[PDB]
Design a protein around this ligand. Sequence first.
Ligand SMILES: [Cl-]
Ligand SMILES: [Cl-]
Ligand SMILES: [Zn+2]
Lengths: 328, 81
Amino acid sequence: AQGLAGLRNLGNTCFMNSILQCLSNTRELRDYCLQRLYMRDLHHGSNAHTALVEEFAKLIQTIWTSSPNDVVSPSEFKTQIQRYAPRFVGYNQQDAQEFLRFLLDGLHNEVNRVTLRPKPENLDHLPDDEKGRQMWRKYLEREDSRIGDLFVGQLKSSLTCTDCGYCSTVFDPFWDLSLPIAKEVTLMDCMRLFTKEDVLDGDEKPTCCRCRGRKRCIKKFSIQRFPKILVLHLKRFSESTSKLTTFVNFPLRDLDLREFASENTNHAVYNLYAVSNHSGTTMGGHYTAYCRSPGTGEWHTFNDSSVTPMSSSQVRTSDAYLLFYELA
Amino acid sequence: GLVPRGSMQIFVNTLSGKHITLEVEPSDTIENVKAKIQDKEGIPPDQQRLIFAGKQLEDGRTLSDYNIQKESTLHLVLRLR
Ligand SMILES: [Cl-]
Ligand SMILES: [Cl-]
Ligand SMILES: [Zn+2]
């Protein structure tokens, strides 16, 4: 059985181990490391302070050449991430999604195909979809890597003035989506709440450029481009600060997001392959991961040193915090 | 009269998924932005994280640094630790 290596907790590093295992079981990312394809994308060598990709890839390699029950130490990798992002220095518990964003940012920057990022425009003459495509091309002139190939999508935000009827549109790239907890509550309810028409009034009235006054506007998201790997981050934060422990019912296969698409499409169906779990209180809690092996299709719990089998029926729990979906 | 509103508006997707509208300048810092969110949401700046185009926005940078333009959405999240 391949890739079933545990990771040693170095002191409150279960957040790190959870995310590493989610990435380890991200098929195309894993292969990028195993086939050493990053070597062609790095433009120069590293030193002791800049070997993030190198140490990440070696860790993935070690996990996927281990025997089952092997425990691997990610100390050298941790040294590299904390040098890139000093917030990870030391041994406090950290948020898994914060770690995810910093790690992928560093991996991406190091293998960016753009080596000299170039230094906007009025696109109102264009139809929505053509403008979207122009904005996407502009983004790729600055950010273009094999890591981006996997995780990057494009949100369309539509802002309609209820007075003059002008709908203003912007296209924001995204590497993940942080979804509100809606309303048992389903993952589809959360995505519906994310994308719902939001009435902006009172202290939230935007200024409409046409009316040149504060106006009640309606803002609505749709997805202009769907990423190969969809990372969904559940906003488990309640107002009255403390953790929202609501059971969110997410599907293991056939997450169909065609309804949230900007245009009619067919390539918006996802299968789950990993989950980052947080159990316990807002402070002093603990991270594990459930991951589907890309080779066998079987699920395992990865809890630091301990890797154990589980049924797919045990994957869905109220501790699910990050969901890793792949295009079907 | 009143102090001027910011030259540019951006949105924040808050914890419940409702959006708020912020009055800003390209030269406003992420700290400035977090203070504005504190004003609207009651969340201390040191608990806030803001994501835009996959980047967590960092104190010491400005909105212009991240090419954040008018009507962009910043995504507000906190922490589980
Ligand atoms: Cl669902
Ligand atoms: Cl910061
Ligand atoms: Zn108007």
